[PDB]
Design an enzyme around this catalytic site. Structure first.
Site, PDB file in Angstrom:
ATOM      1  N   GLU A   1      -8.289  12.825   5.754  1.00 23.93           N
ATOM      2  CA  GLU A   1      -8.248  11.774   4.703  1.00 23.93           C
ATOM      3  C   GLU A   1      -9.126  12.262   3.554  1.00 23.93           C
ATOM      4  O   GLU A   1      -9.957  13.127   3.808  1.00 23.93           O
ATOM      5  CB  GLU A   1      -8.834  10.465   5.233  1.00 23.93           C
ATOM      6  CG  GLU A   1      -8.218  10.000   6.539  1.00 23.93           C
ATOM      7  CD  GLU A   1      -8.742   8.660   7.021  1.00 23.93           C
ATOM      8  OE1 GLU A   1      -8.455   8.292   8.176  1.00 23.93           O
ATOM      9  OE2 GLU A   1      -9.434   7.986   6.235  1.00 23.93           O
TER      10      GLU A   1
ATOM     11  N   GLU B   1      -6.649   0.786  -5.926  1.00 20.01           N
ATOM     12  CA  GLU B   1      -5.670  -0.290  -6.050  1.00 20.01           C
ATOM     13  C   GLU B   1      -5.568  -0.784  -7.499  1.00 20.01           C
ATOM     14  O   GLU B   1      -6.333  -0.374  -8.376  1.00 20.01           O
ATOM     15  CB  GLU B   1      -6.001  -1.442  -5.080  1.00 20.01           C
ATOM     16  CG  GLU B   1      -7.354  -2.154  -5.292  1.00 20.01           C
ATOM     17  CD  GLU B   1      -7.538  -3.319  -4.296  1.00 20.01           C
ATOM     18  OE1 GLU B   1      -8.143  -4.350  -4.671  1.00 20.01           O
ATOM     19  OE2 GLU B   1      -7.020  -3.227  -3.157  1.00 20.01           O
TER      20      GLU B   1
ATOM     21  N   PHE C   1     -27.741 -10.596   4.606  1.00 20.80           N
ATOM     22  CA  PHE C   1     -27.990 -10.309   3.170  1.00 20.80           C
ATOM     23  C   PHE C   1     -27.604 -11.581   2.421  1.00 20.80           C
ATOM     24  O   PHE C   1     -28.079 -11.782   1.292  1.00 20.80           O
ATOM     25  CB  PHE C   1     -27.267  -9.045   2.716  1.00 20.80           C
ATOM     26  CG  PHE C   1     -28.098  -7.792   2.793  1.00 20.80           C
ATOM     27  CD1 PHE C   1     -28.133  -7.035   3.952  1.00 20.80           C
ATOM     28  CD2 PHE C   1     -28.844  -7.376   1.705  1.00 20.80           C
ATOM     29  CE1 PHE C   1     -28.898  -5.883   4.018  1.00 20.80           C
ATOM     30  CE2 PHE C   1     -29.610  -6.223   1.774  1.00 20.80           C
ATOM     31  CZ  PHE C   1     -29.633  -5.482   2.929  1.00 20.80           C
TER      32      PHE C   1
ATOM     33  N   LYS D   1       0.841  -1.224   0.000  1.00 28.89           N
ATOM     34  CA  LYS D   1       0.000   0.000   0.000  1.00 28.89           C
ATOM     35  C   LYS D   1       0.869   1.264   0.000  1.00 28.89           C
ATOM     36  O   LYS D   1       0.513   2.225  -0.710  1.00 28.89           O
ATOM     37  CB  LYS D   1      -0.905  -0.010   1.234  1.00 28.89           C
ATOM     38  CG  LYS D   1      -1.713  -1.286   1.423  1.00 28.89           C
ATOM     39  CD  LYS D   1      -2.622  -1.255   2.634  1.00 28.89           C
ATOM     40  CE  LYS D   1      -3.437  -2.522   2.789  1.00 28.89           C
ATOM     41  NZ  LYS D   1      -4.336  -2.459   3.963  1.00 28.89           N
TER      42      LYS D   1
ATOM     43  N   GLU E   1      -8.502   0.000 -10.136  1.00 30.25           N
ATOM     44  CA  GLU E   1      -9.733   0.346  -9.429  1.00 30.25           C
ATOM     45  C   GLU E   1      -9.720   1.815  -8.988  1.00 30.25           C
ATOM     46  O   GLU E   1      -8.707   2.326  -8.497  1.00 30.25           O
ATOM     47  CB  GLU E   1      -9.973  -0.599  -8.238  1.00 30.25           C
ATOM     48  CG  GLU E   1     -10.109  -2.085  -8.643  1.00 30.25           C
ATOM     49  CD  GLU E   1     -10.780  -2.971  -7.566  1.00 30.25           C
ATOM     50  OE1 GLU E   1     -11.239  -4.091  -7.919  1.00 30.25           O
ATOM     51  OE2 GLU E   1     -10.897  -2.519  -6.403  1.00 30.25           O
TER      52      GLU E   1
ATOM     53  N   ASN F   1     -18.986  -6.828   1.724  1.00 28.23           N
ATOM     54  CA  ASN F   1     -17.698  -6.532   1.041  1.00 28.23           C
ATOM     55  C   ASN F   1     -17.503  -7.482  -0.141  1.00 28.23           C
ATOM     56  O   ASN F   1     -16.397  -7.501  -0.701  1.00 28.23           O
ATOM     57  CB  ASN F   1     -16.506  -6.528   2.001  1.00 28.23           C
ATOM     58  CG  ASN F   1     -16.622  -5.473   3.079  1.00 28.23           C
ATOM     59  OD1 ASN F   1     -17.512  -4.627   3.037  1.00 28.23           O
ATOM     60  ND2 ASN F   1     -15.721  -5.513   4.049  1.00 28.23           N
TER      61      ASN F   1
END
EC number: 6.4.1.3
Lengths: 180, 670
Positions: free
Chosen positions: B203, B291, B351, B119, B278, B238
């Site tokens: 941020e 990323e 879900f 990262k 992305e 996610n």
């Protein structure tokens, strides 16, 4: 006598829908199939009071001759139903299978399921290792028309499976071992 | 006529393995496949020209066991390995072993994978490639002017956050320099008063953070082509559920700018394969690098449809070192594609919740127009506990977005899956949802549209009437077919002459009066005073029934029915339980006593005497319905006990090697 004279000549069906004690219990025993309604029907030669008086045993009517007792322990009844309405609907459904007499062939009705339908799901149903079990009822459902199967004594002696189904619209009887 | 690797080993299971094998056969490359013990008869093994077992069922001992795969490659003289996605696609060590044995790896170099893997470096590389900045601030924000300096370096919008505390106290979005100065001042006062800590962090923030990603294709020669963007905003836990290409949000200018920056990054790190860059895209169409995926992705087919290109074929050509045959100017957007990954999960629980079992029947809706199905399963497939629940990728293609969404809805209604629970009901509802159709979507779409939970489709009065009419017609058709015996000379049958059927139908705790008549194949149904006509062939055996209610075409499934009157009907992708009785039967039912019905399935007990071979659950563990809790051996048959329902283990009352008896408590579930 008439029951015995009719055995094997015309199908006889008994539906126990209430109290039934004494010699009256024997007529249903002589018929081909006996069905019971849960919580409102029972079968026994002698009532709980005589049992207590003679053998000093405490039991209720449901325990002595309830539908659960005769569908899971004694092997006397073939099916138990929730209500009178449910029992009667299932009785009509079941009656649809049988021939009217021993002079007639097995009933054949209109069929929509193709007789040559393939069943690829069975190609791997049986495990290779003989130490693992499967459900034969799945095979029976796959093979028969429309996956419809009327099981007899579903909750009694579960290591074997017996019932009625249709192949190409013709009534058939299914017997199978249950590895499960 | 293009030379290629003679044989390739595909180290993956499921749909991807089948997808790669199809391309290899298309290109004439021979194929080899790797399977665990449980996947011996899986479609990929059958599809492969040759197959080798690589180990036991758990993935760690099979797919992630490189040694077993390496021996297999040596045994098969495999020229090349395609890792698909997941598992060992990004594992450096495997590539080194392949290099040692001179086996080509179809993918990018380890350095390119590792660079994106870090990262901290990935951001320095993104900045150096001049891609939209994604800065991270380790230090603390001292004052409001330092806040503005940092906010300009990160790029607007930014999020100001308290270093201490939770629940969004001391958090503010700032869109410009003035909102930053106030946002910092207010958040510092709120954090000092609430937490006794005035330390703030800044941020970047993204309004409606739509997840938009650009596919990239790279070659050893250094040439690169950008593929059009893909929207993957709809997600649960996610995990992405619905993906579409192109996005309905990007214009031709932004999309090109994103494509050019994604290729600039790919060139900066010398990428040599298909990959994905992305981005987060805000409501103002500012886009920010998230990323750079360095593997073929699961959502690759939607791009393949609009582009007209086979990504797997291109990956193989690049691996041989053949140069790319396309220039960015050759890459067009043709039509619209939508993908809806299908899973074996209960949409109603959370879900999604993992469900296991044997597919007793499985039929894909390929016959329908614009439909492509990417699956790794067949009838009789066993969705196992050990792997991902994905049944298939369902993809639909159209000339425009509407056509693609309509063909999908039609495809989901035509999809037959039996023996497991599945998410089709959720997928079908997302596709028709007015926000989704308008393109008003974000990564929060499922939580925003279903806050309470998924309750299945909600019927409008007309839809309810149509469903009731269809159910009544089906009931009457079954009753009528029940009377069609063949000729019996000894006793001719007397047809029950009925003109009208009066039925009480119970849908959702409501009882509706229905009057149904028929003429030929046309059923006239009066439901609570509304007249409808239902037409169909009334084939009662086919899994899918096509009917026409007042000219509106519907596809319905009859999942089960009983002599009592219960019926489960799949309509508009949702399964409704109705109870149908005759009028007289309904009237007489009023005298029936309601039963206790108390039967707790939480407790799991031993059915037969035996010895507990093993216990697969411990207190606090999560067990899905149909999941094994323990195994009991008797007469050497390895009997298996299954969890009654999804839940947790309140207590385990059994241990391995203990001789249990019938009617003995084994485990408790909440």
């Amino acid at each position: 006598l008439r029951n015995v004279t009719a055995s094997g000549v015309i199908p006889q069906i008994s539906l126990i829908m209430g109290p039934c004690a004494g010699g009256a219990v024997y007529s249903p025993a002589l018929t081909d199939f006996t069905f019971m309604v849960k919580d409102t029907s029972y079968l026994f030669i002698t009532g709980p009071d005589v049992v207590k008086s003679v053998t000093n045993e405490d039991v209720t009517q449901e325990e002595l001759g309830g539908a659960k007792t005769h569908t899971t322990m004694s092997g006397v009844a073939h099916r138990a139903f929730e209500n009178d309405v449910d029992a009667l609907c299932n009785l009509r459904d079941f009656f649809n299978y049988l021939p009217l007499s021993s002079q007639d062939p097995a009933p054949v009705r209109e069929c929509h399921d193709p007789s040559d339908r393939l069943v690829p799901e069975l190609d791997t149903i049986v495990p290779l290792e003989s130490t693992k079990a499967y459900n034969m009822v799945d095979i029976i459902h796959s093979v028969v028309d429309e996956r419809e199967f009327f099981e007899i004594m579903p909750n009694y002696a579960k290591n074997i499976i017996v019932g009625f189904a249709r192949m190409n619209g013709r009534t058939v009887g299914i017997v199978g071992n249950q590895p499960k | 006529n293009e030379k290629t690797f003679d044989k390739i080993l595909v180290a993956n299971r499921g749909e991807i393995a089948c997808r790669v094998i199809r391309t290899c056969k298309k290109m004439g490359i021979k194929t080899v496949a790797i399977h665990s013990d449980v996947d011996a008869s899986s479609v990929h093994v059958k599809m492969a020209d040759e197959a080798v077992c690589v180990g036991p069922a758990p993935t760690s001992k099979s797919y992630l066991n490189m040694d077993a795969i390496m021996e297999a490659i040596k045994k098969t003289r495999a020229q090349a390995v395609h890792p698909g996605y997941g598992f060992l696609s990004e594992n450096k060590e495997f590539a080194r072993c392949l290099a040692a044995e001179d086996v080509v790896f179809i993918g990018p170099d380890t350095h390119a994978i590792q660079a994106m893997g870090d990262k901290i470096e990935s951001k320095l590389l993104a900045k150096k490639a001049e891609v939209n900045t994604i800065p991270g601030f380790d230090g603390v924000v001292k004052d409001a002017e330092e806040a503005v300096r940092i906010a300009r370096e990160i790029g607007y919008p930014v999020m100001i956050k308290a270093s201490a505390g939770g629940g969004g106290k001391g958090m503010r979005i700032a869109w410009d320099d003035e909102e930053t100065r106030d946002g910092f001042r207010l958040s510092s006062q709120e954090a000092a008063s609430s937490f006794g800590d005035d330390r703030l962090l800044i941020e970047k923030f993204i309004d409606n953070p739509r997840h938009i990603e650009i596919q990239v294709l790279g070659d050893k020669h250094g040439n690169a082509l950008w593929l059009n963007e893909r929207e993957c905003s709809i997600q649960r836990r996610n995990q992405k559920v619905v993906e579409e290409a192109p996005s309905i949000f990007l214009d031709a200018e932004t999309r090109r700018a994103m494509g050019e920056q994604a290729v600039a990054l790919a060139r900066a790190v010398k990428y040599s394969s298909a990959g994905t860059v992305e981005f987060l895209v805000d409501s103002k169409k500012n886009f920010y690098f998230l990323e750079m995926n360095t593997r073929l992705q699961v959502e690759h087919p939607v791009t393949e449809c609009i582009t007209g290109l086979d990504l797997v074929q291109e990956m193989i050509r690049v691996a041989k070192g053949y140069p790319l045959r396309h220039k960015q100017a050759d890459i067009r957007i043709n039509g619209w594609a939508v993908e809806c990954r299908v899973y074996a999960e209960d949409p109603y629980k959370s879900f999604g919740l993992p469900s296991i079992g044997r597919l007793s029947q499985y039929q894909e809706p390929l016959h329908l127009p614009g439909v492509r199905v990417d699956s790794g399963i067949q009838p009789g497939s066993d969705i196992s506990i050990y792997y991902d629940p994905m049944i298939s990728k369902l993809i639909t293609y159209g000339s425009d977005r509407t056509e693609a969404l309509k063909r999908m809805a039609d495809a989901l209604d035509n999809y037959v899956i039996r023996g497991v629970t599945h998410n089709i009901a959720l997928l079908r509802e997302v596709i028709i949802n007015s926000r989704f159709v308008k393109g008003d979507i974000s990564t929060k779409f499922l939580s925003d549209v279903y806050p309470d939970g998924f309750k299945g489709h909600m019927l409008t009065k007309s839809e309810k009437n149509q469903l009731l009419a269809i159910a009544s017609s089906l009931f009457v058709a079954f009753q009528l077919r029940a009377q069609h015996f063949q000729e019996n000379s000894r006793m001719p049958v007397i047809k029950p002459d009925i003109a009208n059927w009066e039925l009480s139908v119970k849908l959702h705790d409501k009882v509706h009066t229905v009057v149904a008549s028929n003429n030929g194949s046309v059923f006239s149904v009066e439901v609570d005073g509304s007249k409808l006509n239902v037409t169909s062939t009334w084939n009662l055996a086919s899994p899918l029934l096509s009917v026409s209610v007042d000219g509106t075409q519907r596809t319905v499934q009859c999942l089960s029915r009983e002599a009592g009157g219960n019926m489960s009907i799949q309509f508009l992708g949702t399964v409704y339980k109705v109870n149908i009785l005759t009028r007289l039967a309904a009237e007489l039912n009023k005298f029936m006593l309601e039963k206790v019905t108390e039967d707790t399935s939480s407790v799991l007990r031993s059915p037969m005497p035996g010895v507990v071979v093993a216990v697969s659950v411990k207190p606090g563990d999560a067990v899905a319905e149909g999941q094994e809790i323990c195994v009991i051996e008797a007469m050497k048959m390895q009997n298996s006990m299954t969890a009654g329902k999804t839940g947790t283990v309140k207590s385990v009352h059994c241990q391995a090697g203990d001789t249990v008896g019938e009617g003995d408590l084994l485990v408790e579930l909440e």
